């Protein structure tokens, strides 16, 4: 074991040297050309009320009109954000839902949490209501995040330090992704849905090729647990939020951190993260009940989405960049512009 | 306009159901249950039941519904799945008082300290079930206990005058059990600030009064929360 430890240390030193060699110029020294965007004075356009408990998760629809929200009151409520109307209200068998998903086709939602089971619900039944279409068991820890690739395949992250790619029709893990030491808190599919980055409670993110089932790259730099993660919209970078009150943008093709977003006044972690359509803004929800919009290129905060009465647990930006949504533990969703 | 009418009627049909479910959500008290498996926790669950990543127990006292959430098939790192349990009425923390991991009791002390000072659990009360009082009594009566080797402050600790020993209890038993309770209360009182309260109890795995203890503690918690709303506490 001593020889393997020494080889691991040598490989880590080699990787550090390789990362340092290609890091002659930082992001700011080049983005000084890019002009600042100024204050981003967004306002709450809609307030979605109906959840009786903290809304742990929320996901948009590809149409940028419908969205699904998951709450500890065990309700998966589907809101038409345009008219504030509720489209469906799924009672959950497990109240502790810590994640939810909306399929790209929109036919299926999903939910998971402390029950270790990822439940897939169908919104397009013959009756027209929503029932328990499928149950995907096989995780030995709490579900933290899940993402649909299609109507048949869904990728999930658990509290057992591993991710799992599920074939919905059969119910078996098409793939199992292992390599993290801490609990995996979030994941995000690439725009081409071929790679996905998962952040864990080891202060590290891992980029997995979905077809191979192997970890392509490991990105470090965070100091505490990583709570949320999301790709840059171009698909060749991503962002992470952690308990050390720093957001961190990495790039896959350089393997090393591009930018960090933190302030001295911020002493609370980032619980949710989501890029805008342009990739020029980065919306991060914080434990101090606020959500901040960061100028992802200039690394300075662009604005504050003040108005939430408790911890902001989740966010979501529309595909067309029309509107933002933020859930919270105040049981209120807020649609922002 | 037809689509808007259909959407509005569906939203009304959903909102009536949400109004119906709000009553049952507000009328049911959710309890977290925490502690090691060797501390008699599972026996407490069995006692409350006779009378998967998480296990539920639905019981009721005086027509009041209690929904207790035992944890199973989860990892030992609680720092991320504990934050889901702040809205609960209370955290029933079960301790093996006789288990002083050669020092399991110190592990319980540190876990309780972390729970007490967690920023999301700083408004959640803790009901403390020191569950191995009988085993502690057997250990201290036989003289092989010698809690001094595991806690030096046991010699200079003097039993408070407010202690209420059981009838027919060896004063060493009472002194040891109140020493452990005061070791917990040292953390509980410090950095408490009245936003959440600890309710140390001397329980046993086969007690029938555990449900009544939880009932009274939850009632007291709700009362004190209402008094904090009116700025009376």
């Amino acid at each position: 074991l001593d020889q393997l430890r020494q080889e691991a240390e040598q490989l880590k030193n080699q990787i550090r040297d390789a990362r340092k060699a290609c890091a002659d110029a930082t992001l700011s020294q080049i983005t000084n050309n890019i002009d600042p965007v100024g204050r981003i004075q967004m306002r709450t356009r809609r307030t979605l009320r109906g959840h009786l408990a903290k809304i742990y998760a929320m996901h948009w629809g590809t149409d940028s009109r419908l969205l699904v929200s998951a709450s500890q009151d065990g309700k998966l409520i589907i809101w038409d954000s345009y008219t504030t109307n509720k489209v469906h209200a799924i009672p959950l068998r497990s109240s502790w839902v810590m994640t939810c998903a909306y399929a790209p086709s929109g036919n299926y939602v999903a939910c998971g949490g402390l029950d270790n089971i990822c439940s897939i619900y169908n919104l397009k039944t013959r009756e027209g209501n929503v029932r328990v279409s499928r149950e995907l068991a096989g995780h030995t820890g709490y579900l933290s995040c899940c993402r649909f690739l299609d109507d048949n395949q869904i990728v999930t992250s658990s509290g057992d330090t591993t991710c799992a790619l599920w074939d919905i029709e059969t119910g078996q893990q098409t793939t199992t992704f292992t390599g993290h030491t801490g609990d995996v808190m979030s994941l995000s599919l690439a725009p081409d849905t071929r790679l996905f980055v998962s952040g864990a409670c080891d202060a590290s993110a891992k980029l997995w090729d979905v077809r191979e089932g192997m970890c392509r790259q490991t990105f470090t730099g965070h100091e505490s647990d990583i709570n949320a993660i999301c790709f840059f919209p171009n698909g060749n970078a991503f962002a992470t939020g952690s308990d050390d009150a720093t957001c961190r943008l990495f790039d896959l093709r350089a393997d090393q951190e591009l930018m960090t977003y933190s302030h001295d006044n911020i002493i609370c972690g980032i619980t949710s993260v989501s890029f805008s359509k342009s990739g020029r803004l980065l919306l991060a929800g914080y434990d101090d009940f606020n959500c901040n919009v960061w100028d992802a290129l200039k690394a300075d905060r662009a604005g504050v989405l003040a108005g939430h009465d408790n911890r902001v647990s989740c966010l979501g930006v529309t595909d067309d960049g029309m509107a933002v949504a933020t859930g919270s533990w105040d049981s209120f969703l807020k649609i922002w512009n | 306009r037809n689509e808007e009418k259909a959407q509005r009627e569906a939203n009304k049909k959903i909102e009536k159901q949400l109004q119906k479910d709000k009553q049952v959500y507000r009328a049911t008290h959710r309890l977290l249950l925490l502690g090691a498996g060797e501390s008699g926790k599972n026996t407490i669950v069995k006692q409350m039941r006779i009378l998967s990543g998480i296990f539920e127990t639905k019981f009721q006292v005086d027509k009041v519904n209690f929904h207790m959430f035992d944890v199973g098939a989860q990892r030992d790192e609680r720092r991320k799945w504990i934050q889901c349990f702040n809205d609960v009425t209370a955290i029933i923390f079960v301790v093996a008082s006789s288990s002083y991991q050669t020092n399991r009791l110190q592990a319980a002390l540190k876990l309780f300290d972390s729970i007490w000072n967690n920023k999301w659990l700083r408004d959640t009360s803790v009901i403390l079930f020191l569950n191995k009082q009988d085993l502690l009594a057997e250990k201290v009566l036989a003289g092989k206990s010698k809690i001094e080797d595991y806690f030096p402050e046991f010699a200079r600790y003097t039993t408070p005058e407010d202690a209420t020993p059981e009838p027919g209890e060896d004063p060493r038993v009472t002194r040891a059990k109140y020493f452990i309770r005061d070791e917990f209360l040292r953390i509980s009182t410090a950095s408490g600030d009245g936003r959440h309260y600890c309710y140390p109890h001397f329980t046993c795995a086969v007690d029938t009064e555990n449900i009544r203890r939880v009932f009274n503690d939850c009632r007291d918690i709700i009362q004190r929360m209402h008094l904090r709303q009116y700025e009376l506490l």
Partner: nanobody
Amino acid sequence: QVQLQESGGGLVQPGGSLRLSCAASGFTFSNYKMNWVRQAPGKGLEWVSDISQSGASISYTGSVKGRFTISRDNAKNTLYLQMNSLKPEDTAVYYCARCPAPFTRDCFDVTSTTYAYRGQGTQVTV
């Protein structure tokens, strides 16, 4: 990456003295509470001592009170444990843990079976 490397462990006769040093790299030492934990041969992880951010607040387990002394040099980003009057039941692997989140009073999962922010440990045989 979070790196905690221990040194100073070794073989000592009962009643001897020793000094465990913990070098921390990859994080801001002054903002995290730090803990000394130990695993005895054939037993689970046990918590030995903890010290707060600035070092003002210090706590020890019962079995090491008076004997050992925890401290931390924030300028050198290191954690010290002065071992005095050692006993044969003090033989164990000593890991230098870190609290999971900064600025927070509570430390969770320092004595967990797989903790991501804990050192590799140093053997102390008495």
